[PDB]
Design a protein around this ligand. Structure first.
Ligand SMILES: CCCCCCCCCCCCCCCCCC(=O)OC[C@H](COP(=O)([O-])OCC(O)COP(=O)([O-])OC[C@@H](COC(=O)CCCCCCCCCCCCCCCCC)OC(=O)CCCCCCCCCCCCCCCCC)OC(=O)CCCCCCCCCCCCCCCCC
Ligand SMILES: COC1=C(OC)C(=O)C(C/C=C(/C)CC/C=C(/C)CC/C=C(/C)CC/C=C(\C)CC/C=C(\C)CC/C=C(\C)CC/C=C(/C)CC/C=C(/C)CC/C=C(/C)CCC=C(C)C)=C(C)C1=O
Ligand SMILES: CCCCCCCCCCCCCCCCC[C@@H](O)O[C@H](CO[C@H](O)CCCCCCCCCCCCCCC)COP(=O)(O)OCC[N+](C)(C)C
Ligand SMILES: NC(=O)C1=CN([C@@H]2O[C@H](COP(=O)(O)OP(=O)(O)OC[C@H]3O[C@@H](n4cnc5c(N)ncnc54)[C@H](OP(=O)(O)O)[C@@H]3O)[C@@H](O)[C@H]2O)C=CC1
Ligand code: SF4
Ligand code: SF4
Ligand code: SF4
Ligand SMILES: [Zn+2]
Lengths: 208, 176, 54, 156, 63, 96, 144, 115, 342
């Protein structure tokens, strides 16, 4: 158990659990769940409407002071009714801590823009719009950031094909670069690697 | 533990003021930079005489791929397809069948060298040291098609470079 | 590397002598090791600033 | 014939002049540009072969495609290629430029720059070493040495 | 504020998929069968959606 | 073990050669076909059968860690020889 | 002193086989240095070293003027080095092939080839597999 | 019921108003686009293409979907006005190098296996 | 159909069309469009070239990997033609020069070379041959160019009875000599026209139309021994055509009549250029000669092509001939010229 196994830190676990309880008590209107991971990471699952309040508290409360936005991104889970999972990662330099805030949305429900709370969110939100198609309300300048001009679709969605739908090439007749339906000389070879035996008993699900 | 890089205060004595005025009016630090460049002018340059001299390399160097043989002249590859499964760029294509003598050998072994990232994962995965990345790196072509290697080309590369490949493997197989 | 052949590949001599080592080498280079479910944000002080993976 | 000898000699002179003064466009896309810089670095010193970077496409002879070409960027590469006066040459350096490379099966990547521009030399590697790029450039010089424009014009 | 939309959900116009790949495609929703070469059943737990097989041909170069 | 097709094209060790009516031969015109010369099947067929005084022998391809994974070959059948599934070498007991 | 540098230059031109050999090496390799002959190659390349130069300039090869079929007086490339001298030249080892010859196999090429791109000997890719689907052959006799 | 949250429009009337505003903007922009990009099409062709692109999404009955379509159209228009697009991007709407794929049964049966 | 030559895919770049085409004269104006249209659908294209390989580089991106094969050839060598047509089921001939050199006259490029191509392709078993002649090809025309075209057409028909012969008329495009030829006279200050161009009628055709017609004729099973005439939808007087050309380029149009002997003398004066001539006597004769009417020959519409009017594609050629002042002018600002139809 000693040499090859990652050591635990119970002090950080207890501190993060106490602070999660603190945050949940302060904002019952929006906090739905609090978790502390086995490697001491604190996550708070909230309601979408509380995106702006919660973050503001976490940035401005004297005991939180999470003044840095490390990252903001989305996760696509098609099996859920609310497809998209919005994740905020925040860093507090005063207390040398990190926090995660999660919420959810679907294709037609907008999320409140948090550029007023963190100016770093701007491009991040644009990226989430470009890769996933999640609209952010009251964004100062929302448009594509990563994809090509005129690109249709949202590539990071799970149902989006890996190679996309169109490819580009130079055409000498029209004397310009044109886009055409995609054709692959060698199709990408899909591998089925999942072993038919269970790996982790601790994560077994009920048999429904 | 931290240090300040720009938190120093200039001395205000008459001698220091006159020294700074001389620096401003006579350009002392500019002459210092000129002296640095002049010093470099009289050093020996670091250039080598390519192609007559070459840059140093290592027995671990990853270059052009090759398929190897046993000392009997039989191929080492048994068509397990581990290299194809591990290839991060899907650059390897393999087809196999029983040989006329019942041996388990490939009938197709292609490496797309314009797909390959030259990571060496294939030779780590190979259990018989059949596919290797050789030491050659001067194999530029004039056409795209010349970089689509089939089994004949790789077998040819192995036969051509085996003398150096075996010596490179002998000097590094104890680190693997 | 970690002395755990279900994550880190064994040495080639062991892979060419031991049955367990060959099985683990095969499965590691074909399917790869399974990682328990969960999400992490890991950051380092890269030379250009904080570099992170979620 | 005297005319054939004269055109052969003029052909050799023009080929020598063009191969001895090759000016690549200051142009890089990705990882491969670092090895291009190391080729320009003192250890290899491409300038000793008469190979000098120039920013403007109008004052360039060679385009080294060094890095991934994406769909968003392909029109710009084609445009700066078209603004090169002739004779012009293109070197495809690295797996990404040659055939897509690690990102071959991507929705946003052009599977090889040769779909956009004609290519003279392909330099394999991810990245090719600076020595490999130097080998490719000297191979391009040899290819320029082989060309016969004046002889072809004379035999017309 | 709520607006009480009465219609069935439809996001085809926003997904960016070409219409040929919307109308002529047939998907299969199924629990994949256990691979008969093995006894484990961990691959028969989730539902899968997959598309209908289309044409695959031989590349004239390299086959 | 090279050999030419009726078209004059060399037949590779996989046995592949373009047919008479196949246009793809044009890729070859004004150039060459790679055709690696050494045939592994013939070379392994030229190796002599090893005689060992045991029912079970071990093969690792030679070179120790530089060969193939070590396997054990039974030599109880007298009508045939034990063949390594990796290297192709043949083993037999002293018979007759 | 400067006079000793001039004398070094004079012995450098003297030791290259005279004036014409000096000019030949100057116009063939753009270098006029003199080094100990480590060895000679079966294709005509000569390999020299001088351990007093800094790492990188302490080993070099004067290429042959006549390779397999082509005139390599001016047209030379690094691909003309055979694999054993390739290992020595790139400092993957300290021992030359003369003192540590490579292991001999009957399938190793006896004649090194250079880069044959842009040449009638260039590699042309092709599929090495056989036909998968066989078509039915109609009978050659009339059916009625 | 159905408990949905709007983006900008509460019912379809406001959605059609926004659609009409966006169509006005595109109609006004087309001649400037033809001039600036030096396109070899006529202004009538550009306006016909704009109308066809608008008519492609005429069947929509969800105000939120219409709102997102208007947002995307505004993105495209702002992208064209600022010359962030190139001539290739504008000309991509016309598919000039794509061969006409037939729609009748017999030609499809002749060409291949796809429906 | 020899399974390797069975069509596959969706007719795109990576698809297989079943066409193996040898395109003689692919490094010219029409050849690049023909090769582009062939490589679009996934065809194997063989390009015989005698020029410098640099002059072929623009054809490289027109096909997938291995789909375009470049081979050296000589027009006076039949072994080379056999080498380059050995494995092709289609042979297209586009060889031609608007002037005569010291090594190749009109009869060499329009009679001898086409006849050798047709004969060798018939020997090799090539299934289809497409030959390109002129609409105005006549045995007794004033132009030796068209006389040679007619003789070579008869020779090709004799040597390859199942060949399709295509007769276009004054192709215009970006790299054409037709529209550029008239736009280039602005450098002399005035436009010389025989009879002020009032006795000449022209029916120019778009280059993409001709390329599409060639491709369709290859894919047409009943177009085997037919003869096609490729013409545009409108006929113009030469004066009106040149006036429209100068109006699209926004250049001052100053036409003046020049007698036939003087124009012939000017052509002879320009003919002594060792490089590509600016104009020749034969070009002068062909310019001021009316396009023929051949209603008994199948046209572009019989191959499914709707002819592109010059009013739709003239700007794409003539915008390059404008000054900076008129560079952004739109196409519908020129008021199309008057057509003398029927
Ligand atoms: C005006 C003063 C020029 C005199 C001069 O260059 O002396 C160089 C001489 C060598 O200086 P260094 O390069 O630092 O020493 C490196 C070894 O000498 C490097 O010595 P080496 O072993 O490489 O010998 C090569 C030899 C000959 O090498 C050559 O053939 C190349 C030079 C030919 C150029 C024409 O060098 C020379 O003899 C050339 C010296 C000047 C001729 C020009 O410097 C002096 O003697 C000092 C005098 C004034 C310097 C200020
Ligand atoms: C598309 O093809 C073509 C070309 O290729 C690009 C040409 O260059 C070309 C000829 C190009 C001309 C510009 C050559 C004319 C040469 C100059 C304009 C000088 C002529 C004017 C005078 C001689 C200069 C001094 C004035 C006198 C009155 C004294 C033609 C016709 C052509 O058709
Ligand atoms: C009065 C003047 C009027 C015109 C003014 C113009 C200037 C005159 C032209 C200058 C001539 C100099 C060029 C000659 C240099 C050749 C150098 C030689 O080394 O090249 C060889 C081959 O040389 C060429 O093949 C021939 C060069 C010249 C051919 C004919 C020259 C005729 C010029 C006469 C004047 C014509 C001007 C007409 C206008 C009046 C092979 O070298 P290369 O392989 O590369 O380098 C490899 C590097 N290595 C060795 C380290 C590996
Ligand atoms: N407006 C028009 O263009 C008219 C065209 N004509 C006919 O249409 C055909 C193609 O037209 P176009 O593309 O415009 O003509 P181009 O001059 O542009 O191209 C001619 C082609 O034929 C080749 N060629 C010419 N002479 C020789 C030769 N002696 N030996 C080998 N190859 C040669 C050229 O190769 P290289 O680069 O080496 O010179 C070039 O590839 C021609 O046969 C022409 O006669 C029909 C009516 C309209
Ligand atoms: S080196 Fe890496 S990328 Fe190249 S073939 Fe091997 S595994 Fe694939
Ligand atoms: S090269 Fe090695 S890893 Fe790849 S199939 Fe052959 S034996 Fe297996
Ligand atoms: S080929 Fe490799 S090194 Fe070069 S740009 Fe692509 S990923 Fe980077
Ligand atoms: Zn063995």
């Amino acid at each position: 158990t000693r040499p090859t196994i990652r050591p635990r830190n119970d002090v950080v676990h207890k501190q993060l659990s106490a602070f999660g309880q603190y945050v949940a008590e302060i904002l019952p209107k929006y906090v739905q769940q609090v978790q502390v991971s086995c490697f001491n990471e604190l996550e708070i699952f909230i309601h979408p409407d509380g995106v702006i309040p919660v973050l503001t508290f976490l940035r401005d409360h004297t005991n939180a002071q999470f003044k840095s936005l490390a990252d903001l991104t989305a996760v696509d889970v098609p099996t859920r009714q609310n497809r998209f999972e919005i994740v905020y990662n925040l860093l507090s330099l005063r207390f040398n801590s990190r926090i995660r805030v999660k919420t959810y949305t679907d294709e037609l429900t907008p999320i409140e823009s948090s550029v007023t709370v963190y100016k770093a969110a701007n491009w991040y939100e644009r990226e989430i719009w470009d890769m996933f198609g999640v609209f952010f309300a009251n964004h100062p300048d929302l448009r594509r950031i990563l994809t090509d001009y005129g690109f249709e679709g949202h590539p990071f969605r799970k149902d989006f094909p890996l190679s996309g739908y169109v490819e580009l090439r130079y055409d000498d007749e029209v004397k310009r670069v044109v886009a055409e339906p995609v054709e692959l000389a060698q199709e990408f070879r899909k591998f089925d690697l999942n072993s038919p035996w269970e790996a982790f008993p601790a994560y077994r699900q009920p048999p429904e | 533990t931290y240090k300040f890089v720009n938190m120093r205060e200039p001395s205000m004595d008459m001698k220091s003021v006159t020294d700074r005025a001389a620096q401003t009016l006579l350009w002392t630090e500019l002459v210092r930079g000129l002296g640095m460049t002049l010093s470099y002018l009289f050093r020996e340059p670091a250039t080598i005489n390519y192609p007559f001299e070459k840059g140093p390399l290592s027995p671990r160097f990853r270059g052009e791929h090759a398929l190897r043989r046993y000392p009997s002249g039989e191929e080492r590859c048994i068509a397990c397809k581990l290299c194809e499964a591990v290839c991060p760029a899907q650059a390897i294509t393999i087809e196999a069948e029983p040989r006329a003598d019942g041996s388990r050998r490939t009938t197709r072994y292609d490496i797309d060298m314009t797909k390959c990232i030259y990571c060496g994962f294939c030779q780590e995965a190979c259990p018989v040291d059949a596919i290797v990345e050789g030491p050659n790196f001067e194999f530029s072509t004039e056409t795209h098609e010349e970089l689509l290697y089939n089994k004949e080309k790789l077998l040819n590369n192995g036969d051509k470079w085996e003398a150096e490949i075996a010596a490179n493997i002998q000097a590094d197989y104890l680190y693997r | 590397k970690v002395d755990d052949a279900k994550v880190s590949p064994p040495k080639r001599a062991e892979m060419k002598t031991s049955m367990e080592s060959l099985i683990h080498h095969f499965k590691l280079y074909t399917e790869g090791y399974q990682v328990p479910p969960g999400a992490t944000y890991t950051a380092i002080e890269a030379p250009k600033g904080e570099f992170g993976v979620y | 014939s005297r005319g054939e000898y004269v055109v052969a000699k003029l052909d050799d002179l023009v080929n020598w002049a063009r191969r001895s003064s090759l000016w690549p466009m200051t142009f890089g896309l990705a990882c491969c540009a670092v090895e291009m810089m190391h080729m320009a670095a003192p250890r290899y010193d491409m300038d000793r072969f008469g190979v000098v970077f120039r920013a403007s496409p109008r004052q360039s002879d060679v385009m080294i495609v060094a890095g991934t070409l994406t769909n968003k960027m392909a029109p710009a590469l084609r445009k700066v290629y078209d603004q090169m006066p002739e004779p012009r040459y293109v070197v495809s350096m690295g797996s990404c430029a040659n055939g897509g490379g690690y990102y071959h099966y991507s929705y946003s990547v052009v599977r090889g720059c040769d779909r956009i521009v004609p290519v003279d030399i392909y330099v394999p590697g991810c990245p090719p070493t600076a020595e490999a790029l130097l080998y490719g450039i000297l191979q391009l010089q040899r290819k320029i040495k082989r060309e016969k424009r004046l002889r072809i014009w004379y035999r017309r | 504020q709520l607006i009480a939309v009465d219609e069935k959900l439809d996001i085809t116009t926003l997904t960016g998929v070409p219409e040929e790949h919307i109308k002529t495609r047939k998907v299969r929703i199924f629990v994949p069968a256990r691979n008969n070469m093995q006894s484990g059943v961990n691959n028969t737990k989730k539902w899968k959606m997959e598309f209908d097989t289309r044409e695959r041909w031989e590349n004239p170069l390299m086959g | 073990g090279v050999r030419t097709s009726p078209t004059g094209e060399k037949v590779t060790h996989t046995g592949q050669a373009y047919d008479d009516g196949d246009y793809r031969r044009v890729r070859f015109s004004d150039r060459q076909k790679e055709v690696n010369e050494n045939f592994a099947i013939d070379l392994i067929a030229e190796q002599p059968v090893s005689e060992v005084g045991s029912r079970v022998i071990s093969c690792d391809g030679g070179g120790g860690a530089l060969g193939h994974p070590r396997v054990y070959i039974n030599l109880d059948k007298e009508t045939k020889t034990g063949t390594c599934g990796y290297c192709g070498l043949q083993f037999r007991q002293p018979h007759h | 002193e400067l006079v000793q540098v001039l004398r070094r230059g004079l012995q450098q031109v003297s030791g290259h086989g005279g004036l014409r050999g000096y000019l030949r090496v100057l116009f063939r390799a753009n270098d006029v240095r003199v080094g100990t002959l480590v060895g000679e190659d079966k294709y005509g390349n000569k390999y020299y070293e001088d351990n007093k130069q800094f790492f990188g300039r302490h080993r070099w090869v004067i290429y042959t003027t006549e390779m397999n079929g082509r005139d390599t007086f001016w047209d030379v490339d690094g691909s003309m080095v055979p694999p054993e001298w390739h290992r020595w030249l790139h400092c993957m080892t300290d021992d030359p092939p003369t003192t540590k010859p490579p292991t001999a196999r009957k399938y190793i090429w006896t004649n090194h080839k250079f880069n044959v791109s842009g040449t009638p000997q260039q590699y042309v890719p092709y599929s090495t597999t056989r036909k998968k689907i066989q078509e039915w052959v109609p009978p050659s006799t009339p059916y009625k | 019921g159905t408990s949905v949250k709007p983006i900008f429009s509460r019912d379809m009337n406001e959605a059609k108003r926004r659609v009409r505003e966006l169509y006005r903007a595109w109609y006004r922009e087309v001649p400037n686009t033809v001039h600036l990009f030096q396109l070899d099409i006529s202004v009538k062709q550009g306006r016909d293409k704009v109308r066809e692109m608008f008519m492609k999404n005429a069947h929509v009955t969800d105000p939120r979907v219409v709102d997102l379509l208007v947002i995307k159209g505004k993105m495209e228009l702002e992208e064209t006005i600022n010359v962030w697009k190139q001539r290739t991007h504008i000309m991509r709407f016309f598919h000039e190098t794509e061969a006409p794929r037939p729609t009748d049964f017999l030609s499809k049966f002749y060409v291949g296996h796809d429906p | 159909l020899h399974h390797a030559l069975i069509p596959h895919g969706k007719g795109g770049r990576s698809s297989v069309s079943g066409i193996v085409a040898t395109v003689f004269g692919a490094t010219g104006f029409l050849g690049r469009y023909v090769v582009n249209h062939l490589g679009r659908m996934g065809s194997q294209v063989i390009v015989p070239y005698r020029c410098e390989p640099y002059d072929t580089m623009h054809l490289r991106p027109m096909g997938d990997l291995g789909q375009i094969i470049f081979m050296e050839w000589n027009g006076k060598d039949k072994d080379s033609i056999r080498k380059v047509v050995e494995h092709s089921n289609v042979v297209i001939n586009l060889v031609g020069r608007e002037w005569e050199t010291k090594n190749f006259d009109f009869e060499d490029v329009f009679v001898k070379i086409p006849h050798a191509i047709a004969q060798v392709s018939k020997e090799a078993g090539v299934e289809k041959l497409i030959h390109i002649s002129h609409l105005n090809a006549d045995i007794k025309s004033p132009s030796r160019y068209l006389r040679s075209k007619a003789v070579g057409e008869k020779e090709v028909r004799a040597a390859f009875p199942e060949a399709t012969i295509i007769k276009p008329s004054d192709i215009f495009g970006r790299e054409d000599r037709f529209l550029n030829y008239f736009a280039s006279m602005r450098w002399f200050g005035g436009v010389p026209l025989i009879s002020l161009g009032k006795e000449t009628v022209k029916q120019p055709v778009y280059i993409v139309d001709v390329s599409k017609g060639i491709i369709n004729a290859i894919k047409d099973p009943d177009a085997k021994g037919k003869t096609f005439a490729f013409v545009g939808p409108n006929r113009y007087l030469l004066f009106d055509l040149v006036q429209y050309i100068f109006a699209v380029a926004y250049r001052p149009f100053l036409p003046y009549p020049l007698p036939h002997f003087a124009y012939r003398w000017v052509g002879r004066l320009f003919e002594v250029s060792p490089f590509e001539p600016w104009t020749t006597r034969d070009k002068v004769e062909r310019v001021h000669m009316s396009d023929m009417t051949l209603p008994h020959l199948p046209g572009l519409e019989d191959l499914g092509i709707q002819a592109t009017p010059l009013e739709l594609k003239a700007i794409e050629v003539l915008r390059r001939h404008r000054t900076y002042r008129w560079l952004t002018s739109e196409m519908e600002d020129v008021k199309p010229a008057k057509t003398v139809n029927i």
